């Protein structure tokens, strides 16, 4: 299982990196997979099989184990369903979303108040992300055909186990490519961290733990003449896991220079999910969402992801949210 979700996270990251050349990237694989899994709970046939395989769940056994396993600093996740108030959704579907994701269904009038409904969902996401993710659902992503919106939000804030002293932060050049450099505020500290030199891809891997060391930031930095795209192509979840093992990533006194930075990204996920093989769920006539509703011209009309991260001398704050719009076709 851990390998399933790691494989998904790395594939997601590789696709996003490849689809957004020379652009910052940031996502929450956990948020996206939570939203996609709630759809899976309402899907059948090939619609369901494509989504399970996108999540690296290739057998019925693997699907059941993934969901059953759910049943067992700040870090918080929230899931919610938003359903057209004049529709009914199957009890078994609502029960499964409640049991596995603690998702309740809030009724909205998509048919008569699409814009107020969009604002309500976006306000819910903002609350659950401490204001960091505003306007998850863009204009026209909710309309008279919208019937169900499945939403995940995640929020993290943690202090470093070994924070940087802001005294030693200084502006330095950051090489965005061979011919261009831009200034960054570079944090500095010499301390003992787990650090790997990865000969296979000519890169270094640093671990910076958060307080309690329950969570860590891992930074994969190519050696100074190596293009990051070559590391992206070589990357797999199995390799990344090997490189974090004690034999590769060992405690080392190291001078760390890491930029302070803040990113905000947003994604239309349809092209991503297509690369992972999800096609039927989007297609009028082929989508089978009959485990959510006895209405049976439903399809997946939109899947959006928005994220936020801030890294500075004290720690890290990160948030993300994912929304799936199911509509009547």
């Amino acid at each position: 299982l851990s390998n399933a979700s790691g494989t998904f996270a790395i594939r997601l990251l590789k696709i996003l990196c490849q689809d957004n050349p020379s652009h910052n990237v940031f996502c929450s694989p956990v948020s996206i997979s939570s939203a996609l899994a709630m759809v899976l709970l309402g899907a059948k046939g090939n619609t369901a099989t494509q989504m399970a395989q996108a999540l690296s769940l290739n057998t019925e056994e693997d699907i059941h184990r993934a969901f059953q396993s759910l049943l067992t600093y700040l870090l918080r996740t929230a899931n919610r369903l938003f359903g057209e108030k004049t529709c009914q959704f199957l009890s078994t579907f609502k029960e499964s979303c409640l049991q596995f994701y603690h998702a309740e269904l809030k009724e909205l009038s998509f048919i008569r108040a699409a814009e107020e409904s969009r604002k309500h969902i976006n306000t819910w996401v903002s609350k659950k992300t401490e204001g960091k993710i505003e306007e998850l659902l863009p204009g026209s992503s909710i309309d008279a055909e919208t019937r169900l919106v499945l939403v995940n939000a995640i929020y993290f804030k943690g202090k470093w186990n070994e924070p940087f002293d802001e005294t030693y932060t200084r502006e330095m050049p950051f090489k965005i490519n061979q011919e261009e450099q831009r200034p960054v505020q570079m944090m500095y500290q010499e301390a003992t961290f787990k650090l790997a030199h990865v000969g296979e891809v000519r890169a270094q891997l640093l671990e910076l733990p958060y307080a309690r060391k329950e969570l860590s930031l891992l930074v994969l930095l190519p050696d100074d003449g190596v293009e990051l795209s070559t590391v992206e192509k070589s990357l797999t979840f199995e390799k990344l896991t090997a490189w974090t093992k004690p034999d590769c990533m060992k405690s080392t006194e190291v001078e760390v220079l890491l930029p302070k930075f803040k990113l905000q990204e947003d994604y239309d996920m349809e092209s991503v999910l297509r690369h992972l093989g999800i096609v039927d769920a989007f297609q009028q006539g082929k989508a089978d969402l009959s485990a959510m509703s006895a209405e049976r011209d439903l399809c997946l009309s939109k899947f959006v992801h928005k994220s936020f991260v801030e890294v500075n001398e004290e720690g890290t704050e990160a948030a993300a949210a994912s929304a799936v719009v199911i509509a009547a076709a």
Partner: protein, 32 residues
């Protein structure tokens, strides 16, 4: 001379739950 980690060019990064070995967030820092 000693070990140096100087992240002054593009890198990948990951926020991981260590016990679970779970990638919670990940990304690429390409430009300020």
């Amino acid at each position: 001379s000693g070990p140096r980690f100087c992240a002054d060019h593009p890198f990948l990064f990951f926020i991981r739950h260590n016990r679970a070995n779970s990638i919670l967030f990940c990304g690429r820092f390409s430009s300020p």
